Paper text:
The 22–30 loop in IpCa contains a consensus motif (RRXS/T) for PKA phosphorylation at residue Thr26. Thr26 has a minimal solvent accessibility in the complex and forms extensive interactions with RyR1. Addition of a phosphate group would lead to substantial clashes and thus preclude binding. To verify this, we prepared two variants of IpCa, containing either a phosphomimetic (T26E), or a phosphorylated Thr26 (pT26). To obtain a good reference structure, we collected and solved a structure of RyR1 in the same conditions as the IpCa-bound dataset but lacking any bound calcin (see section below), which also displayed an open pore. Thus, the combined cryo-EM and functional assays show that phosphorylation of IpCa by PKA effectively neutralizes the calcin, and in a cellular milieu, its potency would depend on the relative activity of PKA and phosphatases.
Author numbering:
A (entry chain A): 244 to 321, 332 to 361, 372 to 426, 434 to 630
B (entry chain A): 1648 to 1750, 1759 to 1787, 1794 to 1873, 1923 to 2014, 2020 to 2046, 2091 to 2216, 2222 to 2393, 2414 to 2477, ...
C (entry chain C): 1 to 56, 62 to 129, 135 to 148
D (entry chain A): 3634 to 3681, 3693 to 3736, 3750 to 4020
E (entry chain B): 1 to 107
Write the structure that this text describes.
Amino acid sequence: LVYYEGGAVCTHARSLWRLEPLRISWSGSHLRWGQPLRIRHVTTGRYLALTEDQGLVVVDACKAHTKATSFCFRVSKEEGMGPPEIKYGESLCFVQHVASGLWLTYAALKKKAILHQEGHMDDALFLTRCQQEESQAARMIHSTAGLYNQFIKGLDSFSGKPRPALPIEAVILSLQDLIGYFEPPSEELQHEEKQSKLRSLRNRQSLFQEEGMLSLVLNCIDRLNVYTTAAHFAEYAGEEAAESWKEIVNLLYELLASLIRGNRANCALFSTNLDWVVSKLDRLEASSGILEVLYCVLIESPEVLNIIQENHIKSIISLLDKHGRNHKVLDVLCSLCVCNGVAVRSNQDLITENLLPGRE
Amino acid sequence: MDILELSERLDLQRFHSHTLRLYRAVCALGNNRVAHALCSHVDQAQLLHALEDAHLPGPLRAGYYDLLISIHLESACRSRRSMLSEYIVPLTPETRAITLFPPRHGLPGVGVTTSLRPPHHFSPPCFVAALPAPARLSPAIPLEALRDKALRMLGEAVRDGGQHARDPVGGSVEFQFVPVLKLVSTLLVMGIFGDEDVKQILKMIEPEVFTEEEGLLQMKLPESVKLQMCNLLEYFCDQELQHRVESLAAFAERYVDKLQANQRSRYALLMRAFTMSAAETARRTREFRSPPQEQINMLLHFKDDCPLPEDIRQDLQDFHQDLLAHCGIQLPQSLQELVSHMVVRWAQEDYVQSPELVRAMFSLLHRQYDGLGELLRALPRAYTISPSSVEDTMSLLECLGQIRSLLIVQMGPQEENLMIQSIGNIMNNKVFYQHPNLMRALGMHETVMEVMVNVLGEIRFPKMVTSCCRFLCYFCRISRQNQRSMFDHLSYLLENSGIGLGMQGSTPLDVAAASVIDNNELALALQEQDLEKVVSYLAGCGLQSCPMLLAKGYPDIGWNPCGGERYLDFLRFAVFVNGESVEENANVVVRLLIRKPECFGPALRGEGGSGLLAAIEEAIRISEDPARDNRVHLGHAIMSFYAALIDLLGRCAPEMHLIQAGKGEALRIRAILRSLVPLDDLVGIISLPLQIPVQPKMSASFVPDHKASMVLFLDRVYGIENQDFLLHVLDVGFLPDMRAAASLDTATFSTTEMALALNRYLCLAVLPLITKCAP
Amino acid sequence: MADQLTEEQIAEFKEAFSLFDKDGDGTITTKALGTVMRSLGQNPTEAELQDMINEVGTIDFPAFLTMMARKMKDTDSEEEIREAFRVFDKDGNGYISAAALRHVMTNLGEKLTDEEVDEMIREAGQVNYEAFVQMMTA
Amino acid sequence: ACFRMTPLYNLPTHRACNMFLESYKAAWILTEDHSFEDRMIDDLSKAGKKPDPLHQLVLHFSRTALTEKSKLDEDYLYMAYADIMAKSCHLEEVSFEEKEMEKQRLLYQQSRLHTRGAAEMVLQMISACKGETGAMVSSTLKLGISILNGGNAEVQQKMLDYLKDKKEVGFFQSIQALMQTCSVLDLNAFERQNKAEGLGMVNEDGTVINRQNGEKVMADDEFTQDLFRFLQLLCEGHNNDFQNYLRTQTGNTTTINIIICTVDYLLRLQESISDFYWYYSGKDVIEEQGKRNFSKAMSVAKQVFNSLTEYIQGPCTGNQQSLAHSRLWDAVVGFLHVFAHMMMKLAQDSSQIELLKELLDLQ
Amino acid sequence: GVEIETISPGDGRTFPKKGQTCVVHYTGMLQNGKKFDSSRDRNKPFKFRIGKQEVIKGFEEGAAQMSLGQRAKLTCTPDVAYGATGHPGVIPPNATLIFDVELLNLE
């Protein structure tokens, strides 16, 4: 479905659209009126066309005919860089299908879009530009979503079937490079540059959260962490995958920690999925990543703390008792008590009544 | 292993430092029971020995000092810091002895001050007491050896810094100075230090300027200790300002005694006069009939008429010159000059890159260079109380501190119960009723609304919300100035009360309703946005039924009359004031109701066209069958909603004199109100009889107050002028009710509350109407 | 509005309630409320007390405070008539004239206008002090 | 109820002290003129490399404003210091030498601030408001007009350099939003205000602060005047660079027509003043209560017209062509109609000559 | 019950009487051998009146069986002392307590 929603959806990656002219040579010329060009969604990768099945429905690139997917621009109803220009923000434009010739207007704030012949007088659209960061992030969302969907499909192919090949190398490289991409800015930079980098990082994380990549990462890591030991994955998958499984899970935990570092919305999203993190905390392999994930979730979102009950605190105490004396668990425990100037009495009482009385 | 051995063992030292951090965090922001548990884990003596130790590592020493302060002094220090801003000075004999200058400036922070501050509550730790909810007190410390011991460490650290050793305690000068100075600053904020201790601390701060070795400001310091020095100087300046306020209050008492004696003398002289003039008597009448604020304004005007002798004017001028001299206006040897020069030099020597230090240093700089401005800003919080109410005011202040302590604590059962107990206590105190200006200056309303918003943001703890709303309503009812102060947050309250909770008792919408009542100014100042939000909520009230009603087993319908009844009541209160209708708000209410037809009931909609009389008949039929509808009955809900709508429409009608004048707006509104509801509907509703006593279910019965709204509409919008119309409506609806009341006047049915309700009806809704059109 | 009552009256009310506030919770029975009212000397009728209780068992200090303020509004109004009669003319013996109206308008304290004073006089040398006071009270 | 007002001597001393404190703080210490901003700004800028305390203060404010947040908190210290700096450079026939000396003194007092980085801080904190009114942004505008007072040239160059280097777009969005919110004379509100003013000046048993509460109509008159004065001083001196930059910013992603928004606000003010005249068309004379509001609106119109003039002044073809194609013509026609009828209505009487003088000045 | 293991001799004649104030210096010790409470660390005697319910049952019963100047080791069973619920973060459940207490004065 194609909507005309307005508001927070404007800043999200789904609102972005790309315009690819039919001709390949000198395709970067200025957009003249009547030029036959296509419109595609940058994130999903599908191609928008006026198919007879459902009118205005976006379709995959596997079937998009020129006569069915071409579009034209008209100012009114009525090689080289070539034509000078059409203004951004000040020049209106009317969308029109090349073959059908029907104007684009709202069919009926999730109002559907249909190509009625009458159209409307206020159906004109004016163009605005998007900076490099948004386009780069959206295309990365597309590529990572495709690769990760292929990986999770391959994982589900042999689920519970003891014995193609999973692209372990490409997946590992993607995780490492995404970790590098979401690296926090260093504190040595001045306040202006550091603040600009932090704002850019927050925008990038918000784009990833809106695109739904976080849910897919949760699905992938849940599927990969069903198994217990590398020998078990060797049994279901093979030796080659078993060798890289530790790296894959470590990098997945690292990416999950990085995607929710400092943003309130991403960590508040875990208000209902906290029990999953607490349950998978106790795993031996890849423990530092899940501990860092929990620490970031607890420090960033105050609303998460009210969900925690006695069993989660007891599990944290179990982690402290079973994984030596590390200060990260104790920092997590300290952050549990106080959140940005307000104290939670219940969790403080549980902490003071579980670990302290035992004296062991 | 020795605690001192951890110097080489980095991992164990780090783990112990973070363990101390956890100990602080669990016992942070109150939680005195956990503080007792930590006292069990960490003994009084153990902490004392560590504090005086010299070989302890830096992080461990800092963590130990912070642990001691957080489990022994934190809550009392927080309460005292909260009290530090409110100045309540009683007129005690010690207060009148306060002098602005010593009999040059004196040493700041030393002397006597009568400002009323609550005492500290402590409980000794005894861990074999029988297991027993009371608000458990914080742990107890000797607090007397601590004073001298802190002074001793401060002196020893100053001497060691003067010696310029290469092995400072804790491994750095910061770890040697910052924690002990933090402890000393907290002890000063608490006020434990006496006159001699304050004098010695002042001498340590500056040996030359404050004289009655080397100064601690004179020697080189890093930024971290500069932050605590800045805090200490801020506390000292605050103490100086408090002393100035106390002296100003003492002079106020003296001068008002003189002024009231002079005013009585002037009254006697004026009364003795016989044939002065036609203006001298006018002057006396103007001076003696104006409100006391006006009188004290006229008498205090002799600057740059004024029936005051030159002696009192000269005395006030002398006090004014003394106060300007004290402020440093002059129109290092003193505190202001010393702090200013220290701040300037600190900023000049190095480019400090710690934002907190910069902020605090410049805050002191502004406070010192603007003393008159600081005094002017602090004066509104100041107040004067009679010496006879000091105990009650102390109890009120303790209750206020207790309720303020819950501002930074998540809401729970014990906390909400203690909150309710505090509200009951503040209700039972008489000072809250005697002085509304004091009650507003302490500003309990702000923190009470903050707690209400914190809990509101399904709403848990409903009883505490209801008691909070009752307290807010009573505070509004106390005084008109408090009413203005609460109305200033009307939009905020309405945003909180956007969705009616529906719980029994008071609601934030009731707080909003009580915030604007019996005052023309507030109703005229009622802005567009609040009314627009209210009517939007009413419109949304007509699209779906109440989720609580659906979850209660009630049959599902397309709307919830109970939810809209509160909005109709609020609109009725906001339209009708002092037995009159305000035109500006009536215009807005009519237009906003008519813009959205969904605000009205589904029967009055143009599409359905059920009709109001038919709707009420269907409501009565529904109430007849229990299956079709304490537990709120749907028939009574729809009946009350329609009655409230009719009442709002009637009370929103233009005034009779406006109609007589012929102003277009009033005639247009009366016409549209007539068009909305026909007269036949009113006469039919009045025609409907009411069951009389074996008394019917009062909640589900046909309440006469519905007819009260109906007859109010009939009297206001339409009126009775024709003999035939009056006779017809009267015969149809009015006589049978009077006959029923006369029959029920018998002693067997006199005590029935149905008879009382119908009596209140007759005497307050219809009998005045018959009286008015008697001729 | 509870600001009408004087601090002496509010102290008397607090003492009267504390005389029967041995429980400490603040709750007072309806019979206890009537006993407190009798101790105050009002001696209100049973029907009036029941109506006041039903208007707003569960009687607390603020509720009795509001009830007493509503009751004492009548006493304040009773003294108001005498105050107006004694303030219309200082001597109060046939001293009604336009000069008194001019003096009142000059120093009313609310900054009244000459036209407003003329309108008030028209509401109603020769003048009636009682009629003028009644017109001012409307 | 005024007759039954109790005298002062009957009241207890514990409340008489309270009203004595209130009257004292209202009438004596508030009127005391303490000129101490100059001494502070001189002491802090002496520098005794390492920046002087004034530069550190400006840097700390810039750092506070640059921190990302939903909305900047009402910082009591920033507002206070901003006023201290602003009044410092405001002020401390006439011959040419004396006027030149006074001007040079004003430029030196402005250089005491604009070389420390005051302009960058002002732009940062007005851009960080995200288009929301308040007292802190009002103090920021006060500091801006004080720095730009007298049509200083180097300050405008520094502002242009910083604004182009940062390439931020939120500054013009904030200005547009702030100008959108600015109020215009409203007949309905005035009616509520004058109905409220008809009530007693003394409440029952207490004084009424209705007069001290302030007028509800044209409440943001000082704010609007300061904003338009800041804009006109920003384009003061026939600086062609800003005259071309305000209409359209080439570097920034989105262009905001500040001049067209100013014309839209002027048209809104014209509609409001025409409605206000139509309300007073029937009445023979003009009441003083409405006369004060009329004069306030007249001053606001004068300020906005001066701002538009200062935009136009200089051979800037782009701004002139943009304004020729806007809705300014309909506004001007409406002004001409209301001005003519206002002149004739005032000339009918003789007790409102000052309002006629203001009318002629705005003409 | 409680077992009074006499650490040191004390004056035999003096014994606690109901309604009298007892000052003690108890050095509490957990069952495992760890120390949780000590009055001597606080340097303040633990004043308590015998016959009331202010102090836990085992310590009161043992104090009834004490004598002036005498030292003893009073192991208290969990049912007697803080049974099945302990002071939060101080005493674990169903754990015995061992006290080292000697009397100072009986007045």
